Amino acid sequence: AASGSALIFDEEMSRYKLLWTDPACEIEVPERLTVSYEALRTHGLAQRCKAVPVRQATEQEILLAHSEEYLEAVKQTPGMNVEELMAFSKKYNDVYFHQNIYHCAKLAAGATLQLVDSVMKREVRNGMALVRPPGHHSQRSAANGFCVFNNVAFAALYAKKNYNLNRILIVDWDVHHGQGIQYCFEEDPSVLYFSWHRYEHQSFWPNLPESDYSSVGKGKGSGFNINLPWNKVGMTNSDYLAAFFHVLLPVAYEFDPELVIVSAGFDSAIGDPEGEMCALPEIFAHLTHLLMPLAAGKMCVVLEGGYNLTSLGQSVCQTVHSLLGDPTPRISGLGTACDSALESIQNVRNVQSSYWSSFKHLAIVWPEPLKRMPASVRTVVVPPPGVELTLPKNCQHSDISESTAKEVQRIRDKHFHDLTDQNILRSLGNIISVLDRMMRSDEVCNGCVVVSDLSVSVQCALQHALTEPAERVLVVYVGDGELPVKTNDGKVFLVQICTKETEDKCVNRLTLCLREGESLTAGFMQALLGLILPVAYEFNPALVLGIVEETTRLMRVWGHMTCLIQGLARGRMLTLLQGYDKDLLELTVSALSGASISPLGRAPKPEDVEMMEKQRQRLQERWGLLRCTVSESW
């Protein structure tokens, strides 16, 4: 029922700045705020987001994560001259104070709480706050690393108290370690904290042993703190997505959070002087997109770092774009993570194996991003004739025109001479016309068509896709038969989920024979996050073809599959379901349209996880993004 996204911002938070020479804080400028908000307005994104006003965080809220002694000291900074602010700032590590910074710090915190209440009251689906100062270095009795009050720490504690939540996920993709957040929830198993960060074997600020992968949390909350230390600069999109597919997402989906909060620092993006990483601004479109199936989309993005003003504006727009549900950009050039990334991926999964099921079995210029825009109508639905269905506001039906109708006639005489059934012939007329509207017309994004004959339906859908043209087509098929899909020219990759064990010799095919049982859904999510998504992302298809046979435990997982796989091919996925299932049809259309996805809530069987790692053994040499260990030098 929730809909819309909140952009919380105020130009007042850009009215404090550094007043003395200090190279350790020159980069933290108020223009960070003004540049990103105007980039949002230039690209029409701010106008599409509900503008919730900012608040001052009350004293009682500040005390949720900070001591009275520290709050009292900061409260005295508006009365200091610059000499007294200099002396106050040198008592902390890499942070300056301003006559207005206490004022803005309360606003940055209140803005985060305004976002939390807007999302938890269902007044919006999600949102982002553009705050300054940052927060994730702030500690209970200390300002640290440009941070005065831990904004993200407030949101989790605030959401814990006023909405009695049991599970909150904090994802810190800033290039720095959010040690303030880790310290505050170290023993809290209700707030699962994840942060990747430039570590460089503890030689990069803040130079803490606790920033390493060793720190899994303390006491009752052990295994609820996950650090992924980057030990080399120049991390790429492949490293960031390997981090998601093989660490964060497996843990995040077993945790099943009731709310997601993102410490969104964009100093991890290309060209940032502080992070010195190499991920493109488009990567945050996918980091955002891959998280939105969690907690029914309840996601609050809070700004932290990001200092290259061009790199910063581009990354902000890519995040709000995916927040609004716009199609994701195709990511080209994906491959294996570097050896150093694979080394830290390896170590985190090993130490976390005591706590998380998906691991237990182990025991400077760049191009400007292409324009992103929602389709005129996102999803087109073709139910059987005479079946009227209630459809969301961005979903239509079908009206085959003369030229499309002649194409099915040409196809019939060539490959289907005996095909006389006029019901199949209408399905092929729709398949072509919606594919025509998805690929070339750009007015439609995706679509879903109910079919009668599976064999004929797949050929026309796939063959008409390749000549339109579609450089690559990923085919995801839930069924047991064989399909008219040739997988040798490197143009097609086939994912098959079946009930019969089968051997695969082609390295462009991935068959998963998952054991039938209660285990089915937990094992499917592991193969989705750890095998299907990494391969599909490296493949970079131009189109996704979903096929479901009539012979039903797909209901639980098919929604997240449809939502997550829409990160590929700019979200242009056409689904063919054999036979009419009102619930199944309404589920895919709901997921294809960009609606909220209902959550899941065990652990899989070793018979299945072994089948999956053998698939990984068989394919990771070709598809390096599958790798979760360092390759062995011969």
Least CB distance from residue 313 to ligand Q7V, whole Å?
A: 16
Q: Which is nearer to ligand Q7V, 27 or 73 (CB)?
A: 27
Q: Which is nearer to K ion, 212 or 326 (CB)?
A: 212
- Binding mask 319-358 toward ligand Q7V (x if CB under 6 A, else -) reads ----------------------------------------
Least CB distance from residue 190 to K ion, whole Å?
A: 8
Least CB distance from residue 104 to Zn ion, whole Å?
A: 18
Q: Which is nearer to ligand Q7V, 315 or 519 (CB)?
A: 315
Q: Does 94 participate in binding ligand Q7V (rule CB under 6 A)?
A: yes
- Binding mask 199-238 toward ligand Q7V (x if CB under 6 A, else -) reads ------x---------------------------------
Any idea which residue has 């995801």 for tokens? 476
Cβ within 8 Å of residue 570, ≥6 positions away? 327, 328, 329, 330, 445
Task: Supply the DSSP symbol for 338.
Answer: P
Give the residue among 478, 476, 480 at the shortest CA–CA distance from 493. Answer: 476
> What is the Cα–Cα distance from 19 to 224, expressed in whole angstroms?
40
339 is in an annotated binding site: no
165 conformational bin, left if phi > 0, alpha if psi -120 to 50, beta if neither? beta
Q: Is 397 a catalytic residue?
A: no
Q: Which is nearer to Zn ion, 117 or 267 (CB)?
A: 267
Which pairs from 421-428 meet CB under 8 Å and 24+ separation?
421/452, 421/453, 423/452, 424/451, 424/452, 424/453, 424/456, 424/457, 426/385, 426/400, 427/382, 427/451, 427/452, 427/453, 427/457, 428/456, 428/457, 428/460
Tell which positions 146-175 bind ligand Q7V, by CB under 6 A: 146, 174
Least CB distance from residue 597 to ligand Q7V, whole Å?
A: 31
Least CB distance from residue 273 to ligand Q7V, whole Å?
A: 6
- Binding mask 511-550 toward ligand Q7V (x if CB under 6 A, else -) reads ----------------------------------------
Check if the beta carbon of residue 228 is closer than 8 Å to that of residue 193: no
Count how many residues are written for the chain: 634
> What is the Cα–Cα distance from 523 to 533, expressed in whole angstroms?
14
Instruction: Pick one of ligand Q7V, K ion, Zn ion, none as the site partner of residue 221 (Cβ within 5 to 8 A by kind).
Output: K ion
How far is CA 556 from each of CA 167, 329, 480, 524, 597, rounded to the nearest angstrom? 21, 27, 19, 10, 10
Q: Assess whether the previous peptide bond of 469 is cis (omega < 30° from 0).
A: yes
* Interface residues toward Zn ion, by CB under 5 A: 174-176, 265, 267, 305
C-alpha neighbours within 13 Å on the C-beta side of residue 556: 12
Check if the beta carbon of residue 208 is closer than 8 Å to that of residue 179: yes
307 is in an annotated binding site: yes
Q: Which is nearer to K ion, 221 or 297 (CB)?
A: 221
- Binding mask 18-47 toward ligand Q7V (x if CB under 6 A, else -) reads ------x--x--------------------
C-alpha neighbours within 13 Å on the C-beta side of residue 178: 33
Q: Which is nearer to Zn ion, 269 or 462 (CB)?
A: 269
Residue nearest ligand Q7V, Cβ-based: 305
Angle, helices 422-439 vs 454-467, to 10°: value is 30
How many CB atoms are closer than 10 A to CB 36?
27
Q: Does 145 participate in binding ligand Q7V (rule CB under 6 A)?
A: yes
- Binding ligand Q7V (rule: CB under 6 A), the pick from 188, 239, 258, 274 is 274
From 43, 66, 136, 137, active-site residue: 137
Q: Which is nearer to K ion, 354 or 401 (CB)?
A: 354
Instruction: Pick one of K ion, ligand Q7V, Zn ion, none as the site partner of residue 197 (Cβ within 5 to 8 A by kind).
Output: K ion
Any idea which residue has 């299945």 for tokens? 608
Q: Is 398 exposed, middle or buried (0-12, 13-18, 19+ CB in 10 A)?
A: middle
* Interface residues toward K ion, by CB under 5 A: 172, 174, 185, 188, 193, 195, 197, 217, 221, 224-225
176 is in an annotated binding site: yes
Instruction: Pick one of ligand Q7V, K ion, Zn ion, none as the site partner of residue 224 (Cβ within 5 to 8 A by kind).
Output: K ion
> What is the Cα–Cα distance from 321 to 316, expressed in whole angstroms?
9
How far is CA 179 from each of CA 24, 302, 431, rounded to the nearest angstrom? 18, 16, 52
Least CB distance from residue 144 to ligand Q7V, whole Å?
A: 8
Q: Does 265 participate in binding ligand Q7V (rule CB under 6 A)?
A: yes
94 is in an annotated binding site: yes
Cα separation of the two ends of the chain: 56
Q: Which residue type does 163 have?
A: Y
Q: Which is nearer to Zn ion, 10 or 267 (CB)?
A: 267
Q: Which range of residues in 130-138, 337-345, 398-406, 603-611 is near ligand Q7V by CB under 6 A?
A: 130-138
Cβ within 8 Å of residue 467, ≥6 positions away? none
Reported as type and span, the H/E element at residue 380 is strand 377-382
Q: Does 180 participate in binding ligand Q7V (rule CB under 6 A)?
A: no
Instruction: Pick one of Zn ion, ligand Q7V, K ion, none as the site partner of residue 27 (Cβ within 5 to 8 A by kind).
Output: ligand Q7V
267 is in an annotated binding site: yes
Cα of 24 vs its chain's centroid, Å: 32
Q: Does 267 participate in binding ligand Q7V (rule CB under 6 A)?
A: yes
Q: Which is nearer to Zn ion, 172 or 282 (CB)?
A: 172
Least CB distance from residue 131 to ligand Q7V, whole Å?
A: 11
Q: Are strands 299-303 and 126-129 parallel, antiparallel or unpaired?
A: parallel
Least CB distance from residue 27 to ligand Q7V, whole Å?
A: 5
Instruction: Pick one of ligand Q7V, Zn ion, K ion, none as the site partner of residue 195 (Cβ within 5 to 8 A by kind).
Output: K ion
418 is in an annotated binding site: no
Query: Which amino acids are annotated as binding site for Zn(2+), given as ranges?
Result: 174, 176, 267
Specify binding-site residues for substrate.
22, 94, 307
Active site residues: 137
Contacting residues toward ligand Q7V, per CB under 6 A = 24, 27, 94, 134, 136-137, 145-146, 174, 176, 205, 265, 267, 274, 304-305
**Binding-site residue set:** 22, 94, 174, 176, 267, 307
